[PDB]
Amino acid sequence: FMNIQLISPIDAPILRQWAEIIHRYWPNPSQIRYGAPNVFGSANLFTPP
Amino acid sequence: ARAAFLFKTVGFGGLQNVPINDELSSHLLRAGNSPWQLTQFLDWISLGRGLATSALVPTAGSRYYQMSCLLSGTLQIPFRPNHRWGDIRFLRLVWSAPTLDGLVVAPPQVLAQPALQAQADRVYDCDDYPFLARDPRFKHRVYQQLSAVTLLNLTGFGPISYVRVDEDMWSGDVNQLLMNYFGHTFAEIAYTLCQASANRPWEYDGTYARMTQIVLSLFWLSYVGVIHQQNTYRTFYFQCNRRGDAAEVWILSCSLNHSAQIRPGNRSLFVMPTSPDWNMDVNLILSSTLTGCLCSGSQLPLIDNNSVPAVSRNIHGWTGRAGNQLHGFQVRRMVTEFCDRLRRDGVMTQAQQNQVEALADQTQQFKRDKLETWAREDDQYNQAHPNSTMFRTKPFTNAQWGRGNTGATSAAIAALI
Amino acid sequence: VLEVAAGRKYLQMENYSNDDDDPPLFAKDLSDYAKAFYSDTYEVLDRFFWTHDSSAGVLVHYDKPTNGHHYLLGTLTQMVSAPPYIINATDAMLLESCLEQFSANVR
């Protein structure tokens, strides 16, 4: 799974295609801003407030 | 906006070590092990409604000085070139966690090992410490109290405050926020502002910073006596019913009688008390604390080298070759200046001035006697114990009990308007 | 602060086969490898990154920038054309810039 070159293009073409699709089309994480910590403060621990 | 983060530690007042010991340190850390004790100090002074006192903390300035001494003596461990945080002890105390979160009793091995010998009048840069460099919010939160300590330790007199007058500061949001403090006192306003600053560091030219500068200017103008009920700064002033009292209370107020005329421009200067009786004046210490909280991201002007001792010269962010002069004053003489200015303005009479003078004289006598007695007790304790010498209040000299540049300071503050 | 997506720098043809002699592409041929933040002052950019994630890593050119002061933040993509190593985007751009500078120093 981590190294696609191990999957044979001839013996397992469908599996190689599926692995490539998984690597190049899985969703990408992102972030957004929320809250008003002026009054409520911030309770975030492992992330920026 | 500030670009360099430097601070100065306290200097020995004739002793051979930092004037603090285990008893004072334990009394300070009695209810919390965090060395950053601004909120604890605010709670202890109890809104400045009365004269706070204790066995080990005679005055509020005493606690302020002890906080400064504790921070100065403790911060020298992680600021060694090796930058190790938890391998050496200072007065049976060790840091917990590299992020400088609290002080705890030393482990048995460190207790057996010798302690650290601290030095006097050290100047340090916050960005040298790796963790402070890595985390901006942590550095900005700490630098407020570091700046307050520096403003107290810069000279041998009382703390330093910054006064600025500028008409362009006022705006709609500033007016809306300022109108909400119509009936509150200076101590309450300072409490709320300090808590807000602690929750969030302010930016360079924010609403909170501008309102803080406006409040400081209003308080100092009212204290001098340029602004009063019949001569207001945009219908705002500070009222004090009992001038010259031991614990003065100042209340924000509005009046539609008259508004003074303000010349356009931007002016500012630096004020400080010289007489030792500042230890029992909450308002001055709170003003200095507000200036320190402002200093986090504002980059105030430079202070002239000739107004500070040799060891405080050429600090990268604070002192400089050509800078503003420090104006020092005496409280008792400033009371007389206040009364005289009001009488010339025509809103006070001779009998009222005489009553205020008598009350001020009584207060000065009481404070002088108490301070001298406490100093003598400290001297005797230091004589008795040669291995745990300490000071409970910032040392002073007999010469500081006389009037200094009070007239010039009053004239400068009056000309500010 | 203006946020701009970073476009591709290389484009593959059909006969790219991850060969030993194929030129490396440093992951700059994928859809999104980095993201640029443009402003006017570095202190404003720094204040902006107080309340924004930066675990991936932030890179900067202090010399003449392409279109003005800007920071660059990498994504979670990977470079797999140089076995037996798997290299993420930030390290890939660092390596490319380092090699360019070394060639410039030589020539």
From Swiss-Prot, chain B:
Assembly and binders: Interacts with protein mu-NS; in viral inclusions.
Organism: Reovirus type 3 (strain Dearing)
Lineage: Viruses, Riboviria, Orthornavirae, Duplornaviricota, Resentoviricetes
Principal subcellular localization: virion
Further comment: Mutant ts447 is temperature-sensitive.
Source species, domain of life: Viruses
Subcellular location: Virion
GO cellular component term, pick one: viral inner capsid
InterPro entries documented for this protein: Sigma_1_2_reovir
Protein name: Inner capsid protein sigma-2
Family: Belongs to the orthoreovirus sigma-1 protein family.
Keywords (A to Z) from UniProt: Capsid protein, Inner capsid protein, Virion
Function recorded in the entry: Inner capsid (core) component.
UniProtKB/Swiss-Prot annotation, chain C:
Taxonomic superkingdom: Viruses
Residue(s) at site: Involved in formation of the phosphoamide bond: K28
Compartments in which it is found: Virion
Function: Outer capsid protein involved in mRNA capping. Catalyzes the last 3 enzymatic activities for formation of the 5' cap structure on the viral plus-strand transcripts, namely the RNA guanylyltransferase, RNA-7N- and RNA-2'O-methyltransferase activities.
Family: Belongs to the orthoreovirus lambda-2 protein family.
Subunit and interaction comment: Interacts with protein mu-NS; in viral inclusions.
Name of the protein in its database record: Outer capsid protein lambda-2
Species per Swiss-Prot/TrEMBL record: Reovirus type 3 (strain Dearing)
Lineage, opening ranks: Viruses, Riboviria, Orthornavirae, Duplornaviricota, Resentoviricetes
Gene designation per UniProt: L2
Residue numbers of the full-length protein present here: 163 to 269 of 1289
